[PDB]
């Protein structure tokens, strides 16, 4: 009754639905806590990440850096494969993928540069060939430059700069953090206070309005205690903006319009600690002495409830939900609550290979100085136990185990982890994604299915900027691990393969293993 190709198409349709039923983040990070890790040696074929190459800082940048009179700073434009260095009032960009790069110098600025960022342009403003806007903040003003990052035959963007006549006086508030939205909105913050500013700009000059303006969205007044920002974070999928303060206060702002920004949540460390105390498992790794060192937004495509990850200096990952009071009038949330905690692993890095309760006391990630999360959960933590050498903890969801876990009530935040050692003197500065953002589906269910996209998009790669160079870290897929493991079985017995294969079956299941 039903011919071959139609029968096989039925199998495809049911297989597509099976891959798109991969558990969403909310489902395996339910209220509670977890310490589930399988640690892998960095030199192992089972390593979830590994360093593929490194790019030294050009010698000319070292000449300028050591010629610094007062202030210097480094940063990453990982989206286009560029890095930058500021020396006092001078800025230098370069393509770090190029073996002998030329330095793009920009020295028009009159005062010390305090922040630099590469953001999308405002639509309908610039010629289509302008791909980005370069924001340069000094102690006196903020400067906008047009950017065209067109790809070259070699695979590294060609960068040319355009003047704009767009600039505004800074004012009294320091600018150390610049972030941009998908639509080209530019937000500013710094180390003077917790105020958030926005830069507006338009093509036409008017007699009653300049081409470029600046406004303070915080509208402060009266008595104000000392407090400033540690970072700004954007989530376009929810039209939200987050700030982290030096007191570990998390503020949430909603973009109710193309020119509006409204503060909708303010959650201090005490509130986080109160939520934590109401959880079943309390821990000495999170107290009133603990600092939150970084935030990472979680987009709505990845999870409905969990909006935000917060990293403590003890290495705890705090996952916070946010909820609106109502269901209709984007809808702004009005509450934020600490729901789930991923506690640190226990295994420390070792030169020699060393040999079920919730582990809520590990110090392996203490102190955590910098932290980053990328969908579907790739986690980088800069652990600074010693003041000269950084250790990099890198982990990923155990996609294979999460996909096979049954029933749904048994789902936990299983992870594969590893330690990547940086040489003595390497101080990590920034980590950015070099490939396209990960997404296996368009909604939380199916979103995190790494297995499904092994052959549709290249493995994620991450540029780790240090004070000596840029290191490229690459995510390894099942097929990469399987191929590497088999490569070690080439010189062994019939039973040597069967043993290695059984490791894969016990983690990924038989079908996924045979498919690899």
């Amino acid at each position: 009754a039903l011919p071959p190709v139609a029968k096989a198409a039925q199998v495809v349709n049911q297989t597509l639905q099976l891959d798109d039923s991969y558990p969403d983040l909310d489902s395996y990070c339910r209220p509670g806590a977890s310490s589930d890790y399988e640690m892998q040696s960095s030199d192992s074929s089972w390593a979830p990440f590994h360093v593929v190459r490194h790019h030294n800082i050009p010698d000319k940048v070292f000449e300028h850096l050591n010629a610094g009179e007062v202030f210097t700073k480094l940063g990453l434009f990982a989206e286009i494969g560029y890095a930058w260095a500021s020396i006092d009032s001078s800025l230098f960009l370069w393509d770090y993928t190029h073996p002998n790069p030329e330095l793009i110098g920009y020295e028009e600025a009159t005062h010390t540069i305090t922040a630099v960022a590469l953001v999308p342009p405002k639509p309908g403003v610039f010629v289509k060939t302008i791909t980005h806007v370069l924001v340069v903040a000094t102690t006196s003003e903020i400067i906008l430059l047009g950017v065209s990052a067109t790809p070259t035959p070699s695979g590294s963007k060609s960068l040319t700069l355009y003047s704009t006549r767009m600039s505004v006086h800074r004012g009294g508030s320091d600018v150390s953090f610049i972030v941009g939205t998908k639509d080209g909105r530019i937000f500013l913050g710094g180390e003077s206070d917790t105020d958030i500013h926005e830069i507006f700009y338009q093509q036409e000059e008017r007699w009653f309005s300049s081409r470029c303006g600046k406004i303070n969205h915080s509208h402060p007044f009266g008595s104000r205690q000392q407090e400033w920002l540690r970072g700004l974070y954007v989530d376009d999928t929810r039209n939200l903006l987050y700030s982290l303060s030096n007191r570990s206060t998390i503020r949430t702002y909603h973009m109710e319009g193309p020119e509006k920004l409204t503060k909708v949540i303010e959650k201090d460390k005490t509130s986080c600690l109160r939520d934590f105390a109401h959880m079943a498992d309390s821990s000495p790794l999170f107290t009133d002495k603990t600092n939150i060192v970084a935030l990472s937004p979680i987009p709505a495509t990845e999870a409905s409830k969990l909006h935000l990850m917060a990293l403590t200096d003890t290495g705890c990952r705090l996952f916070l939900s946010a909820t609106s009071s109502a269901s209709y009038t984007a809808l702004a949330p009005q509450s934020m609550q600490l729901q789930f905690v991923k506690f640190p692993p226990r295994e420390s890095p070792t030169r020699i290979r060393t040999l079920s309760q919730l582990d809520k006391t590990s110090r392996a990630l203490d102190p955590s100085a910098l932290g980053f999360r990328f969908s579907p959960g790739y986690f980088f933590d800069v652990v600074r136990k010693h003041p000269n050498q950084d250790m990099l903890f890198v982990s990923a969801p155990d996609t294979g185990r999460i996909k096979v876990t049954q029933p749904a009530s048994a789902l936990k935040y299983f992870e594969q982890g590893t330690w990547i050692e940086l040489e003595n003197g390497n101080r990590t500065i920034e980590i950015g994604l070099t490939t396209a953002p990960f997404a296996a589906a368009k909604q939380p269910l199916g979103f995190g299915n790494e297995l499904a996209v092994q052959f549709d998009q290249v493995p994620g790669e991450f540029a780790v900027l240090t004070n000596t160079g840029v290191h490229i870290v690459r995510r390894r897929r099942l097929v990469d691990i399987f191929a590497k493991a088999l490569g070690n079985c080439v010189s062994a017995s019939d039973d040597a393969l069967e043993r290695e294969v059984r490791k894969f079956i016990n983690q990924y299941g038989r079908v996924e293993t045979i498919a690899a």
Binding site: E107, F126, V127, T160, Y162, S163, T164, Q203
Partner: peptide, 14 residues
């Protein structure tokens, strides 16, 4: 080498 800054005329339309 100081980067050549092409003019605003090309940059913004129309």
């Amino acid at each position: 080498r100081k980067a050549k800054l092409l003019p605003m005329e090309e940059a913004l339309l129309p």
